[PDB]
């Protein structure tokens, strides 16, 4: 039975920690259950405003700085955007290289999210100190692949290091943790806490390697520097030695995914099976990613290996094609000027206007993206439902595997547990595809090393750039006039998931997902974190 | 138990790329740094506590008897009484002001905290400023967008164990920022011989010719990128792309257009 108090009243959590950026969550609680919610983004920067009048070639370098967690993705979306505006189709090698860098980003981003952002909501680190390192090793030898990191010796060494750290009195990043002293909402046995904590620390080393792999093609991480209008600049990234080192690093990262991430995920999901009934939404959108034909946005949507689509009312029998004309953003409940509702991004307007904290009429720096009046969840769970519904072979196999291991129906994936599982599921699938994708590019680049197409700047034009970033459906939209930026609008996965109410007063995905959240302890409302963290919030992304 | 120096890390108007850069450190790795070298006592990106718990961890850090060092990531949005950038219902400018007041030292990680950064670029709708400017305090600047973790962690270690490092006119440690990117660039002999790529599709580009004609800002940018590389493997020019000048103050406006020299 899921713990829940009798608490009735408001709860504000600000800051929401272990996300990117600046988020305030406000809820009304009755009888220990959330009955209303508000997602309030607390920073504005105004990149869209900054871009006005600038060189379209410069856009990618500004927009990349929307986010350093989902680094790269905005540079890619802007490049796709401007390629489409100047009507250039990139060479095959450039499509391949840009897509591999995205694959590398997914691996880095998802791994860090699970361990370093999300796990502390489910894992009680201090209780790891109660475990017998030997019983824990035994448990790990029965729920996971054999590995030296999982030995009694290795787990004792982890425990010893943590013990010395805690007994020092300087708890650092664990100061005032919601799990300190025990918490009713934390179910894991001490042994699982120890295993997960050991992997948390290993993950801190492994993400360096994931980033090195990414930097071989991207030039550096964070903030890649290899994309240009018409393709890519990195001729060395098509050669044999760097691609062999890229393959090897990727294999090490994927071994860690298969040995640690997925088994930890499934163990947590096993103990928190009640969270498969908490935090569901109904509508899903993806632009798709990993396309075999990126010559146009329409081709991207059509040929993405992680497919695009639109699911409404949880109906997996009816995946609709993406209508890019049906996207618009409202500002009714946002800190922008009157009269900006219902704008398609090509006609987007960014006129900031602040009021006051917790003004129920205006409470976020995020706009509210809508699709034919409806809010849309984007991200791994959206991609997973869409791919599954379309019978994408890798997704079908892995989803059904997870469902078989957990003994739950596919309908239990419309939940915070599902959202968390989905992130792991697609990580395994990206990992399974890496060697094939690298071989494709090595083989292609060795026959011909064309990486960038010739192009000309038009006087007046418009273009859209689509990508499914780690957090979901991302689009950059440009109006060019006089060879300059006349308008540049970003509509970002977190804007979809975490923005405020639309013009109809309808709650966003995160706000909807928060309703019915049980709160065991209003002093320490970890359940709010669990659902919010599950969406992988990125506020600098959502607001830009 | 040996007491480890307290570090408070504040996030203002930023993209969290500097936090991400920092955790790419391998000398030492971040786990070893925070378990053995420092006491990282507030850090929104990775800390366990949230909301009021987190706010109280900050207060506890700020009132620590042994004092603390301050790391600041991001610029300060000053329009409307600082209300366009808030944490825990307080303007970023207000919290950074209060934390700076008693800090043993202030390290600005990234071009944003150092100089104002991307949000400060024209027309600067949020009236964003760098820290030194907004608060009136001396900062140790570790710029770049993001800086190399070698530079940040090196500065942090140096300040904890040796003192304040020698700084150039822009507040940057000469240890890392003393030389131009250009002076250590392997394409330099191409530059000297006027061997330039005219476009990215050209045979000259394939041959690794200099990128000056394609807007490279190495000749006017102080950083150690070609010497230390990023992620142990690469840097932008090696990846065939011009330097953006991203460690220079206000580069968003002084270095643009990026693909030109005008
Ligand atoms: S300096 Fe660059 S990487 Fe660092 S916070 Fe500012 S925009 Fe992000
Ligand atoms: S590519 Fe840039 S840093 Fe290198 S020699 Fe040419 S101008 Fe200098
Ligand atoms: N992934 C990611 Fe960042 C967000 N939200 C983007 O785009
Ligand atoms: S863009 Fe920045 S990271 Fe180095 S190569 Fe130029 S200073
Ligand atoms: Mg926008
Ligand atoms: Ni992001």
Residue to test with chain A: of B48, B95, B253, most A Cβ within 10 A: B48
Please name which of A13, A257, A213, A224 lies closest in space to residue A113, comparing C-alpha atoms. A257
Q: Give me the residue label for tokens 């142990």.
A: B232
Residue B116 in contact with ligand 1 by CB distance below 6 A = no
Instruction: Give which of A427, A446, A431, A354 is closest to A384, Cα–Cα.
Output: A427
Q: Is the dihedral of CA A328, A333, A336, A340 positive or negative?
A: positive
Per-residue DSSP letter, A362:
B
Alpha helices per DSSP H over A409-518: 416-447, 493-498, 509-514
Please name the residues between 79 and 108 in chain A that touch chain B, using a CB distance below 8 Å: none
Contact (CB, 8 A) for A399 and A392: no
Buried b (16+ CB within 10 A) or exposed e, B220-231: bbbbbbbebbbb
8 A C-beta contact, residue B153 and residue B170: no
List the catalytic residue out of A108, A414, A423, A471.
Answer: A471
**Contact at CB, A235 and B43, closer than 8 angstroms:** no
Sign of CA dihedral B157, B160, B166, B168: positive
> A494 catalytic, yes or no?
yes
Interface contact A405, partner B, CB < 8 A: no
Write out the DSSP string of A517-542.
Answer: -B-S-TTS-HHHHHHHHHT--BHHHH
Both tokens of A290, joined, read 């990993």
The whole-angstrom separation of Cα A219 and Cα B151 is 18
Place of tokens 């890496």: A434
What whole-number distance in Å separates Cα of residue B256 and Cα of residue A57?
10
Catalogue all structural domains in chain B, each as residue range(s) with its CATH number: 1-176 (3.40.50.700), 177-261 (4.10.480.10)
**A13 neighbourhood in chain B, CB within 8 Å:** 50-52
Residue A247 contacts B where some CB pair is shorter than 8 Å? no
N- to C-terminal Cα distance for chain A?
Answer: 41
Contact list in A for residue B23 (CB cut-off 8 A) is: 204, 207-208
Token output for A359: 């003004």
Distance from the A418 Cα atom to the nearest Cα atom in chain B, whole angstroms: 23
The CATH number of the domain where A391 resides is what? Answer: 1.10.645.10
CA gap A333, A341 in Å, rounded: 10
Distance CA A238, CA A205 (A): 27
Exposure of A201 in the CB half-sphere (CA atoms within 13 A): 20
Alpha-carbon distance B115 to B124, whole Å? 13
The one catalytic residue in A254, A431, A452, A538 is A538
CB B207 within 8 A of CB A235: no
- Beta bridge pairs of residue B234: B230
Cα(A277) to ligand 6 centroid in Å equals: 28
- d(CA A5, nearest CA chain B) in Å: 19
Using CB atoms and an 8 Å cut-off, which of residues 181-240 of chain B contact chain A? 199-201, 205-206, 208, 230-236, 238-240
Does the annotation place A232 within a ligand binding site? no
**Contact assignment for B244 to A226 by CB distance below 8 Å:** no
Measured CA angle at A366 (ends A493, B81), to 5 deg: 145
Q: Is A540 on the interface with B (CB under 8 A)?
A: yes
Residue with tokens 């699982």: A192
Chain breaks in chain B (C to N over 2.5 A) after: none
Neighbours of B67 (CB within 10 A): 12
Distances (CA, A) of B10 to B47, B58, B61, B98, B147: 12, 9, 12, 11, 17
- Measuring CA to CA, which residue among B156, B150, B61, B177 is closest to residue B107? B156
User: What is the DSSP-derived secondary structure letter of residue B36?
Assistant: I
Give the residue numbers spanning the domain of A10.
Answer: 1-544
**SS3 label, residue A356:** coil
Return the bridge partners of A462, or none.
A479
Cα B105 from Cα B99, distance rounded (Å):
10
Number of domains, chain A: 1
Orientation angle between helical segments A190-218 and A133-143, nearest 10 degrees: 60
CA distances from A375 to A126, A283, A370, A507, A512 (A): 39, 7, 5, 8, 10
Is B176's C-beta closer than 6 angstroms to any atom of ligand 2? no
Assigned token pair, A145: 């692949």
DSSP calls for A131-187: S-HHHHHHHHHHHS---GGGSHHHHHHHHHHHHHHHHTS--GGGTT-TTTT--TT--
Count of C-beta atoms within a 10 Å radius of residue A237? 27
User: Could you give the CA distance from residue A234 to residue B127 in angstroms, rounded to a whole number?
Assistant: 37
Method of structure determination: X-ray
Look up A541 and say whether it is catalytic: yes
User: Following DSSP, what letter does each residue of A58-78 receive, concatenated?
Assistant: GHHHHHGGG-SSSTTHHHHHH
Compute the CA torsion angle B13, B17, B21, B22 (nearest 10 deg). Answer: 40
Residues A96 and A107: their CA atoms lie apart, in Å, by: 17
Instruction: Give backbone dihedrals phi and psi of A413, rounded to 5 degrees, phi first.
Output: -75, -20
Phi, psi of B23 (to 5 degrees): -75, 0
Determine the Cα–Cα distance for residues B98 and A530; give it in Å rounded to an integer.
Answer: 31
* Residue B112 beta carbon below 6 angstroms from any ligand 1 atom: yes
Alpha-carbon distance of A228 to A214, in angstroms, equals 17
User: How distant is the alpha carbon of residue B143 from its chain centre?
Assistant: 4
Q: Which residues pair with A369 in a beta bridge?
A: A329
- What is each CA distance from A407 to A259, A294, A387, in whole angstroms? 21, 39, 21
Distance from C-alpha of A384 to C-alpha of A50, rounded to nearest angstrom: 35
Start-to-end CA span in chain B (Å): 58
The CB density around residue A449, as the number of other CB atoms within 10 Å, is 14
B259 membership: H or E segment, kind and range: none
CA separation, residue A457 to residues A57, A82, A405, A485, B196 (Å): 9, 10, 54, 12, 22
Q: Looking at the partner chain, which of A164, A175, A219 has a beta carbon nearest the beta carbon of B239?
A: A219
Token pair of B72 as six digits: 């600041």
């Amino acid at each position: 039975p899921t713990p829940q108090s009798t608490f009735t009243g408001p709860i504000v959590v600000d800051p929401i920690t272990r996300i990117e950026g600046h988020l305030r969550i406000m809820v009304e609680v009755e009888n220990g259950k959330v009955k209303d919610a508000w997602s309030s983004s607390q920073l504005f920067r105004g990149l869209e405003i900054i871009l006005k009048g600038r060189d379209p070639r410069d856009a990618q370098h500004f927009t990349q700085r929307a986010c350093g967690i989902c680094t790269y993705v905005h540079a890619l979306a802007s490049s796709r955007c401007v390629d489409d505006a100047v009507k250039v189709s990139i060479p095959a090698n450039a499509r391949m290289m840009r897509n591999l860098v995205m694959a590398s980003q997914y691996l880095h981003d998802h791994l860090v999210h699970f361990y370093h952002f999300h796990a502390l909501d489910w894992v009680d680190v201090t209780a790891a100190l109660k475990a017998d390192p030997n019983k824990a090793a035994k448990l790990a030898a029965s729920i996971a692949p054999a590995r030296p990191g999982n030995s009694a010796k290795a787990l004792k060494a982890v425990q010893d290091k943590l013990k010395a750290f805690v007994e020092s009195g300087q708890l650092g990043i664990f100061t005032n943790a919601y799990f300190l002293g025990g918490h009713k909402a934390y179910y894991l046995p001490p042994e699982v806490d120890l295993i997960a904590t050991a992997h948390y620390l290993e993950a801190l080393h492994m993400q360096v390697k994931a980033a090195s792999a990414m930097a071989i093609l991207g030039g550096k991480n964070p903030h890649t520097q290899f994309t240009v209008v018409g393709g890519c600049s990195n001729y060395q990234g098509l050669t044999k030695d760097p691609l062999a080192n890229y393959l090897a690093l990727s294999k090490e990262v994927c071994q860690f995914v298969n040995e640690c991430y997925i088994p930890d995920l499934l163990a947590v999901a096993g103990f928190y099976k009640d969270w498969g009934g908490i935090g569901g939404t109904s509508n899903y959108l993806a632009f798709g990613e990993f396309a075999t034909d990126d010559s146009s946005p329409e081709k991207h949507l059509a040929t993405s290996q992680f497919p695009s689509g639109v699911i409404t009312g949880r109906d997996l029998g009816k995946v609709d094609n993406v209508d890019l004309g049906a996207i618009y953003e409202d500002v009714k409940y946002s800190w922008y000027a009157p009269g900006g509702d219902g704008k398609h991004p090509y006609d987007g307007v960014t006129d900031p206007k602040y009021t006051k904290l917790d003004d129920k009429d205006h409470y976020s720096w995020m706009k509210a993206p809508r699709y034919k009046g409806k809010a849309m969840e984007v991200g791994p769970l959206a991609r997973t439902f869409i791919a599954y519904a379309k019978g994408q072979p890798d997704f079908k196999k892995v989803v059904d595997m997870v469902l078989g291991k957990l003994s739950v129906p596919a309908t239990a994936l419309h939940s915070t547990l599902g959202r968390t599982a989905a992130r792991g599921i697609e990580t395994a699938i990206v990992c399974a595809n890496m060697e094939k994708w690298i071989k494709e590019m090595a083989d292609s680049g060795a026959k011909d090393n064309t990486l960038c197409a010739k192009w000309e700047m038009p006087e007046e034009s418009k273009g859209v750039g689509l990508a499914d970033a780690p957090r979901g459906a991302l689009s950059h939209w440009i109006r060019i006039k006089g060879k300059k930026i006349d308008n540049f609008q970003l509509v970002v996965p977190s804007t979809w998931n975490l923005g405020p109410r639309g013009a109809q007063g309808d709650k966003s995905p995160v706000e909807e997902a928060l309703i019915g959240t049980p709160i065991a302890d209003p002093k320490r409302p970890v359940e709010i974190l669990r659902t919010v963290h599950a969406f992988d919030p990125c506020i600098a992304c959502g607001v830009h | 138990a040996k007491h480890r120096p307290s570090v408070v890390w504040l996030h203002n108007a930023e993209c969290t790329g500097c936090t991400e850069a920092a955790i790419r450190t391998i000398k030492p790795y971040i786990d070893a740094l925070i378990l053995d070298t420092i006491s990282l006592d507030y850090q929104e990106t990775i800390m366990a506590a949230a909301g009021e718990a987190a706010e109280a961890a900050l207060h506890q850090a700020l009132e620590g008897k042994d004092g603390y060092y301050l790391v600041v990531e991001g610029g300060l949005p000053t329009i409307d009484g600082g209300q366009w950038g808030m944490v825990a219902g307080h303007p970023m400018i207000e919290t950074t002001k209060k934390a700076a007041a008693k800090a043993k030292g202030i390290i600005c990680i990234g071009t944003c905290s150092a100089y104002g950064g991307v949000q400060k670029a024209k027309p600067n709708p949020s009236q964003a400023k760098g820290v030194s400017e907004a608060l009136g305090v001396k900062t140790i600047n570790i710029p770049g967008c993001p800086p190399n973790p070698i530079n940040f962690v090196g500065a942090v270690v140096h300040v904890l164990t040796k003192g304040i490092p020698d700084l150039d006119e822009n507040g940057r440690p000469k240890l890392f920022y003393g030389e131009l990117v250009h002076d250590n660039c392997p394409r330099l002999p191409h530059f000297e011989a006027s061997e330039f790529a005219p476009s990215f599709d050209s045979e000259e580009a394939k041959k690794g010719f200099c990128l000056y004609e394609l807007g490279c800002k190495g000749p006017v940018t102080y950083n150690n990128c070609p010497k230390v590389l990023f992620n142990q493997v690469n840097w932008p020019v090696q990846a065939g792309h011009p330097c953006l000048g991203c460690s220079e103050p206000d580069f968003w406006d002084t270095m643009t257009p990026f693909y030109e020299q005008g």
